[PDB]
RNA sequence: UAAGUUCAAGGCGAAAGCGAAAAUUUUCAAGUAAAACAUAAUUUUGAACGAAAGGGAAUACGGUUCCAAUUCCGUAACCUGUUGAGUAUCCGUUUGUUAUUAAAUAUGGGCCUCGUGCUCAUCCUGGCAACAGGAACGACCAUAAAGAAGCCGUCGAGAGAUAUCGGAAGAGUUUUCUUUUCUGUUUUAUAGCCGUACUACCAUGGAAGUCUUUCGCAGAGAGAUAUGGUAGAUGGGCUAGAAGAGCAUGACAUAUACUGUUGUGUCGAUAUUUUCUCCUCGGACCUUGAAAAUUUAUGGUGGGGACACGCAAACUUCUCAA
RNA sequence: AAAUUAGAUCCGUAACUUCGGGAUAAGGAUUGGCUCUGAAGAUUGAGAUAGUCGCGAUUAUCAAUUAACAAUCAAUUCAGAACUGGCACGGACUUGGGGAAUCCGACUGUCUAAUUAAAAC
């Protein structure tokens, strides 16, 4: 609720303990229930595997990108948004990505991202039409109001 | 008609004063309190109700028999009979692919 | 018979909101509420639960889709592009 | 060519024995009018054996290594056949269809134990007596 | 214990009895709309049930077969038939038009 | 009263009990009821024939109390 | 338990105290029919409060008072906990019996004078299945489910109520009419039974000349129609409670003289879009509609029990008792 | 301020219009009582032909019914006609006056509890 992209509940096994881990992800478009997700260094390039940004070709469209390595998914994770692997710089190990702002940032190349655009795009083309339908939008987010103007 | 009054001090209409009109041997029209609807368990992945199990309620199941809560087979009150054989053949054709991929 | 000449599904907002935003939302208001053919078992039963998530009434597969359309064209051009990079980088 | 033949180890798929492994004893390919569908009488295992290591001595040894069978005529749609065939279970001579009377479901299901454990040691049909987490 | 006041239903029973004969049911005595007095959705639902239990009565007696049953079932929703007599009329002649041609 | 024995001998089995304090006999116009009073429950034997009803009014334990309702 | 709150030394501040929320904090928390060349496996958000409308074990009737009643009285149940009793293992041999058998969930094997010799064997059965029965390895891990849920509608079902029509018993009107008008005509919780609204499923079988079906659409070679089964005893009828109980209407009898009694309580069928429940099937949404104690089922490795010539058992998921 | 209109059935309905509307536009007719008449359902349908034994009880059936198959039974609504009075009849009650424009705000929503509900937000 509030977040316009769907989430996905993925069940990994624990490699050291004897239980089942239950991970929330942010859905790549085309992800469906019952499919396999591979996360790791030796992930094949298919949606929605998540693998380090060095094992990708250039121009690969990615989502759920780690800003710093290991920090579990901080970039391009709204609805309909993605990053693009522009070009590696093979040693010095710094991929450059293009981010949904237009802005073009340099990451490292050991951090991970999941392949694919994110699901739920593109929400923002429907008109709201209705003050009461923006009420409903925002009552699961916060008190950004009916924003009365300061000039009033 | 004989109008009714509530016999508990909860005067509001929530989900825990569910009541029915009763006629008693004095010709009375009194209220009887209904407890909550018993339900059966679901399959572990269908989210469809199971059969062979009586509809129970979480406090009643200590005071129920064993065979009133089970079916009789493997994964009995846990999975459908169809989701069960969907696993028996999957736990076999995968563990027979893992011999022809080993030789 | 045919009940409306031109509005179709947006006669429910009737005389509300201006003709362009009714015209604009109607494209999305049809594809959402449509039944797409299920790409897992074949039936015209792939309807939308919430924004971005589509599910099939038989076969019980929920997918992650677009806000109104089941599969966007901006995402099938990614599923193509990824497997033509997968063809080069694997073998 | 024809499958669901005599010695083939099948997998039960329905009803109080789901997941158990079973040889077939006698096959009724074209449906005896009592149960007119394709069916076969199987002889499987209700309760698997358990593993013995070298450290457990003699009667903790014989306690983990029993076998409890069953005898059940089953549909072909409630079976899954394998590539695997039981081979040295060769004395199904007197078990055709006399499991209607209750005492000779017990002089026979006991007599399937005198052979389902003579082939346990010596270890043959090793895929047959494994639990196979179905 | 002072007996209850007699509250007689004699007068209402007399005018329910007049209004089986249609005595106070005219256009000065009508205050609800004709949908509010008799619902069209209830009216069309009992008709659609009269026809559907006629057609299952004919199909499962032995009278008509599947291929005329389904063709009339789909025609019954519609307004080809307003009663069950016009549907019985129509069945009585498409069995005349049929076994002649057969 | 959650029990009723539809059988003769299993009613008399519930007479020779450590409980089963009383039999509150009622004579109805068509049958006689033999309502024996254990701890919980009480136990009714409806016998209709009107003549072995007095044959089962005897063949009870002696010290078992018996009411005869009016 | 929620939203949240109060405290716990990271901290901070002259302190008060943060109109902090501390999340502070060497082993800060668990675990053991408890161990071996560390006994040995594991986990840190400490803690508590915060709902007389959320969640959450168990009861109803009839009677009773100047004043209290789901609390007293009578009657019939129920829950929780702790003990006790009964009761899933009453053999082929050979006692009654020459074997045939009888006591008897009950043996097989090979030989042996047959065998009583020898040896083997019981953590239950049935159904093709959906699943069933009185019980038939809660000692931990693991997974799943129940608790557990919104709003608008909805086919069907039952309840309550109201209304019609008859029968039995009283009452009211009667100058005239009115086979009239009225009143009541009852059956709790709990439980044994048999069935049903609808839904899902199972077996058979294989559908175009497409068919089944709804008010609506909805469904089918990923298995329709069809016929036969299973489950959900949803929500009802018979019986038990129910003592022509009790209750209520009503005919007498008996003075406050400290009370008895005869009869009734029976049929049918409406429509309640307007009540409450149960079941079904939908819709709106850039809005997707609580949590925890609590509870159960399954699965898993070990470990526990059980032996036939019979003695047993069972924190026993069974029945009862104190 | 008050009056006017008002229920329902039927007919008919303009300028503009974001083609949804406007619209209950506007404009008209009908309406009580009493006697009938028509139409709209359900459930078993209904079974025709020896006589053993003494028509009676143990005692038959594929189908054609059919074009109102025949009785029972069930609710209620809608059309029609005849007669009929102080036109009083939606007889109380419940219950819209309409139209031609100009200005502002699009709309539903919100506001100065106790003088401003707006064109303000």
CB D17 within 8 A of CB B72: no
Burial class (CB in 10 A: 0-12, 13-18, 19+), A72: exposed
Enumerate the β-bridge partners of residue E49: none
Written as six digits, the tokens of C27 are 């494209």
Chains B and D physically touch (3 or more Cβ atom pairs below 8 Å):
yes
Output the CA–CA distances (angstroms, integers) from residue A2 to A134, A140, A141, in the order listed. Answer: 12, 5, 5
Given an 8 Å threshold on Cβ–Cβ distance, is C78 in contact with A121? no
Identify the chains in contact with D, defined as 3+ C-beta pairs within 8 A. B
Distance CA E79, CA E68 (A): 17
Closest by CA position to D117, among listed D66, D56, D59, D52: D66
Per DSSP, the three-state class of C23 is: helix
CB A86 within 8 A of CB A69: no
CB D11 within 8 A of CB D79: yes
Span between the terminal Cα atoms of chain B, in Å: 85
Written as six digits, the tokens of B8 are 């508990």
HSE-CB at C32 with a 13 A cutoff on CA atoms is 21
Tell how strand A112-115 and strand A61-63 pair up.
antiparallel
- Who's near B44: CB < 8 A, 6+ residues apart? B75, B78, B79, B83
Breaks (C-N over 2.5 A) in chain E follow: none
DSSP notation for A71-129: S---BS-SSS--EEEEE--TTTT--EEE-TTS-EEE--SSSEEEES-BSSTTGGGS---
Question: In chain C, whose CA is at the least distance from the CA of A116?
Answer: C78
Alpha-carbon dihedral angle through residues E75, E80, E81, E86, given to the nearest 10 degrees: -110
Per-position b or e across B23-61, b if 16+ CB within 10 A of its CB: eeeeeeeeeeeeeeeeeeeebeeeeeebeebeebeeeee
Per DSSP, the three-state class of E17 is: helix
Helix ranges (DSSP H) in D9-93: 61-64
Distance CA B2, CA E6 (A): 18
Enumerate the β-bridge partners of residue C48: C54
Per DSSP, the three-state class of C81 is: helix
Cα dihedral sign for B64, B67, B71, B73? positive
Residues of chain D positioned with their CB less than 8 A from the CB of B88:
11, 13, 18-19, 80, 134
Q: What angle do CA C56, A26, A11 make, to 5 degrees?
A: 75
Distance CA A8, CA A24 (A): 6
Backbone phi, then psi, for D42, in 5-degree steps? Answer: -110, 165
Closest by CA position to A99, among listed A42, A149, A134, A61: A61
Q: Considering CB atoms only, which of D16, D18, D83 is closest to B88? A: D18
Written as six digits, the tokens of A16 are 């050291």
* B58 CB-to-strand G distance under 7 Å: yes
CB D5 within 8 A of CB D28: no
CB pairs under 8 A between A and C: 123
Given an 8 Å threshold on Cβ–Cβ distance, is A30 in contact with C71? yes
Distance of CA E23 to the CA centre of its chain: 22
**Angular region, D49: left φ>0, alpha ψ -120 to 50, beta rest:** beta
Give the DSSP letter of residue B36. Answer: P
Per DSSP, the three-state class of D43 is: strand
- In chain E, positions 5-34 with C-beta closer than 7 Å to nucleic chain H are 18-34
- Who's near F47: CB < 8 A, 6+ residues apart? F8, F31, F32, F33, F34, F53, F56
* B55 CB-to-strand G distance under 7 Å: yes
Enumerate the β-bridge partners of residue A20: A13
Enumerate the β-bridge partners of residue B22: B30
Closest by CA position to A30, among listed A104, A113, A115: A115
Alpha-carbon dihedral angle through residues B85, B86, B92, B98, given to the nearest 10 degrees: -170
DSSP notation for A4-27: -S-EEEEEEEPSSSSSEEEEEEEP
Burial class (CB in 10 A: 0-12, 13-18, 19+), A148: exposed
Residue that has been written with the tokens 């679901």 in this structure:
B42
List chain G nucleotides near protein: any atom < 7 Å from a Cβ: 42-43, 52-63, 70, 75-81, 106-108, 120-137, 141-148, 159-165, 171-172, 180-192, 200-205, 209-220, 222, 230-233, 239-249, 261, 273, 276-279, 283-289, 293-306, 317-318, 320-322
Q: Residue B86 belongs to what H/E stretch?
A: helix B81-88
Given an 8 Å threshold on Cβ–Cβ distance, is C52 in contact with A4? yes
Output the CA–CA distances (angstroms, integers) from residue B92 to B81, B86, D19, in the order listed. Answer: 17, 10, 10
HSE-CB at A45 with a 13 A cutoff on CA atoms is 25
Q: Residue E66 belongs to what H/E stretch?
A: helix E66-76
Method: cryo-EM
Enumerate the β-bridge partners of residue D45: D69
| D18 CB within 8 Å of a chain B CB | yes
């Amino acid at each position: 609720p509030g977040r316009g992209a769907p989430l996905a509940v993925v069940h990994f096994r624990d490699p050291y303990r004897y239980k089942i881990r239950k991970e929330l992800f942010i859905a790549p478009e085309g992800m469906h229930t019952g499919q396999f997700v591979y996360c790791g260094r030796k992930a094949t390039l298919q949606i929605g595997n998540v693998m380090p940004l060095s094992q990708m070709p250039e121009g690969t469209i990615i989502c759920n990108l780690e800003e710093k390595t290991g920090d579990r998914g901080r970039l391009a994770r709204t609805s309909g948004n993605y990053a693009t692997v522009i070009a590696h710089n093979q040693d010095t190990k710094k991929t450059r990505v293009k981010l949904p702002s237009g802005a073009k940032k340099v990451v490292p190349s050991a951090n991970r991202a999941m392949v694919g655009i994110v699901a739920g795009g593109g929400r923002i083309d429907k008109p709201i039409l209705k003050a009461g339908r923006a009420y409903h939008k925002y009552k699961v987010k916060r008190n950004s109001w009916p924003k009365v103007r300061g000039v009033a | 008609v004989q109008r009714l009054t509530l016999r508990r001090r909860l005067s509001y209409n929530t989900r825990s004063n569910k009541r029915r009109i009763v006629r008693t041997p004095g010709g009375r029209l009194v209220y009887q309190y209904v407890k909550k609807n018993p339900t059966v368990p679901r399959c572990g992945q269908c989210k469809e109700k199971l059969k062979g199990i009586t509809p129970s309620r979480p406090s009643e199941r200590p005071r129920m028999s064993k065979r009133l809560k089970t079916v009789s087979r493997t994964y009995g009150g846990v999975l459908c009979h169809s989701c069960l054989r969907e696993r028996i053949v999957r736990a076999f054709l995968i563990e027979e692919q893992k011999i022809v991929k080993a030789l | 018979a045919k009940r409306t000449k031109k509005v179709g599904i947006v006669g429910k907002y009737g005389t509300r909101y201006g003709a362009s935003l009714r015209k604009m939302v109607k494209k999305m208001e049809i594809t959402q509420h449509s039944k797409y053919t299920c790409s897992f078992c074949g039936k015209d039963s792939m309807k939308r639960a919430v924004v971005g998530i589509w599910s099939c009434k038989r076969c019980k597969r929920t997918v992650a889709g677009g806000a109104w359309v089941y599969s966007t064209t901006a995402a099938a051009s990614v599923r193509s592009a990824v497997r033509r990079l997968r063809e080069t980088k694997e073998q | 060519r024809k499958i669901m033949k005599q010695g083939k180890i099948v997998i039960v798929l329905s009803g109080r024995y789901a997941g158990r492994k079973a040889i077939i004893v006698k096959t009724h390919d074209d449906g005896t009018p009592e149960k007119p569908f394709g069916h076969a009488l199987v002889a499987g295992i209700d309760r698997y054996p358990r593993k013995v290591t070298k450290k457990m001595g003699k009667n903790k040894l014989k306690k983990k290594s029993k076998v409890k069978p069953f005898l059940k005529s089953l549909n072909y749609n409630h079976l899954m056949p394998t590539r695997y065939t039981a081979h040295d279970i060769s004395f199904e001579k007197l078990s055709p269809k006399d499991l209607k009377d209750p005492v000779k479901r017990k002089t026979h299901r006991f007599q399937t134990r005198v052979k389902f454990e003579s082939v346990y040691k010596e270890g043959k049909n090793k895929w047959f007596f494994q639990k196979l987490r179905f | 214990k002072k007996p209850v006041v007699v509250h007689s239903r004699y007068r209402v029973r007399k005018n329910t009895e007049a209004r089986r004969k249609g005595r106070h049911c005219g256009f000065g005595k009508r205050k609800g709309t004709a949908n509010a007095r008799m619902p069209t959705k209830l009216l069309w639902m009992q008709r659609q049930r009269v026809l559907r239990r006629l057609l299952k009565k004919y199909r499962d007696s032995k009278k008509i077969d599947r291929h005329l049953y389904h063709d009339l079932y789909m025609k019954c929703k519609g307004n080809v038939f307003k009663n069950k007599r016009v549907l019985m009329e129509y069945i009585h002649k498409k069995k005349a038009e049929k076994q002649r041609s057969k | 009263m959650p029990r009723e024995i539809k059988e003769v001998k299993d009613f008399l089995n519930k007479a020779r009990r450590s409980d089963a304090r009383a039999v509150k006999i009622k004579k109805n116009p068509t049958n006689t009821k033999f309502k024996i009073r254990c701890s919980r429950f009480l136990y009714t034997l409806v016998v209709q024939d009107k003549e072995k009803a007095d044959k089962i009014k005897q063949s009870l334990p002696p010290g078992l109390q018996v009411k005869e309702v009016k």
